Amino acid sequence: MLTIGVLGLQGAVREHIHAIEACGAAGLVVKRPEQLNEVDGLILPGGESTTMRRLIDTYQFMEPLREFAAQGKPMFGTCAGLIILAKEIAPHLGLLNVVVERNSFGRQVDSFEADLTIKGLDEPFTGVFIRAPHILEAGENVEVLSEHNGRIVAAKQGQFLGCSFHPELTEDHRVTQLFVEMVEEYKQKAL
């Protein structure tokens, strides 16, 4: 069976692990780069991308994360991790071909929920947005999974998955399951 990592340098990880476990996979909190060899896919979560990036440097994760990607292993950037996985205008990994802008809303108005139609899910999914990054543009190689008021909020590209909301702050595990299916799909093809 599958093991999915959650990068554990910064921010909350307990809910992501719970969601992974709820989908029938094993969860591992990844605190050191060598542990990437122990998982079949990786969630990159976090709340504070700048903080997260500084820690990524401190703990020397950047090149291991690039090698993990090169192995074909799925990676799911949620909320801040979307920033780490994708591009900015115009560093981090630049693996997912979308340009992302950091949140600009103040602390008293930076959160909302919205019911989303997500490709691959039948019933709407309650998206939890908290200082959500904004995707400004998606490349031609990127599959849009969900949009809300004209803004791309979930996207997929091969082994990469990204969303700007928190799919783990709910008891609805259908978005995590989409990711688990990508990992299962990698696991089947892996030689």
Curated annotation (Swiss-Prot):
Pathway: Cofactor biosynthesis; pyridoxal 5'-phosphate biosynthesis
Catalytic activity, reaction form: aldehydo-D-ribose 5-phosphate + D-glyceraldehyde 3-phosphate + L-glutamine = pyridoxal 5'-phosphate + L-glutamate + phosphate + 3 H2O + H(+); L-glutamine + H2O = L-glutamate + NH4(+)
Cellular component annotations (GO), alphabetically ordered: cytosol; glutaminase complex
Effect of residue 10 to N: 10-fold reduction in glutaminase activity
Record-level GO BP terms: glutamine catabolic process; pyridoxal phosphate biosynthetic process; pyridoxine metabolic process
List of residues binding L-glutamine: 47-49, 102, 130-131
Active site: 79 (nucleophile), 166 (charge relay system), 168 (charge relay system)
Superkingdom of the source species: Bacteria
Effect of mutating residue 10 to E: Almost no activity
EC number: 4.3.3.6, 3.5.1.2
Outcome after substituting residue 131 to A: No activity, disturbing interaction with PdxS
Consequence recorded when altering residue 10 to A: 3-fold reduction in glutaminase activity
GO molecular function annotation: glutaminase activity; identical protein binding; pyridoxal 5'-phosphate synthase (glutamine hydrolysing) activity
Keywords: Glutamine amidotransferase, Hydrolase, Lyase, Pyridoxal phosphate
CDD domains assigned to the protein according to its UniProt record, in alphabetical order: GATase1_PB
Signal peptide positions (record): none
Subunit structure: In the presence of PdxS, forms a dodecamer of heterodimers. Only shows activity in the heterodimer.
Protein family (similarity comment): Belongs to the glutaminase PdxT/SNO family.
Chain's role: Catalyzes the hydrolysis of glutamine to glutamate and ammonia as part of the biosynthesis of pyridoxal 5'-phosphate. The resulting ammonia molecule is channeled to the active site of PdxS.
Name used for this protein in its record: Pyridoxal 5'-phosphate synthase subunit PdxT
